[PDB]
Amino acid sequence: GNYNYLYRLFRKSNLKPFERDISTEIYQAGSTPCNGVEGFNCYFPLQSYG
């Protein structure tokens, strides 16, 4: 399994044309603040292809 290729799974809004987003900010999917710590409802915005 090659996991070097990634895709963004979460984002507050859709991209405008030709926009490039390389940010790694932790996405808070719930009501609990993440404070930069990944976990339940606190996800790394990127995920690897299998």
Partner: protein, 62 residues
């Protein structure tokens, strides 16, 4: 680093449309010390940059 380039009154216009950064420029000599003089001139385009970078703030440097 996706890009790098190396080469009175000055007027510039900055817009960001579809990830393209348009910079229009113009220059002219002046003699005034209060504010920008009254008059009219046109600012031709000088740079189009394919940044594709989000913009919500800027800051000058002097």
């Amino acid at each position: 680093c996706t890009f790098e380039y190396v080469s009175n009154l000055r007027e510039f216009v900055f817009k960001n449309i579809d990830g393209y950064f348009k910079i229009y420029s113009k220059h002219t000599p002046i003699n005034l010390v209060r504010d920008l003089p009254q008059g009219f001139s046109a600012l031709e385009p000088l740079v189009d940059l394919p940044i594709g970078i989000n913009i919500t703030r800027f800051q000058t440097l002097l």
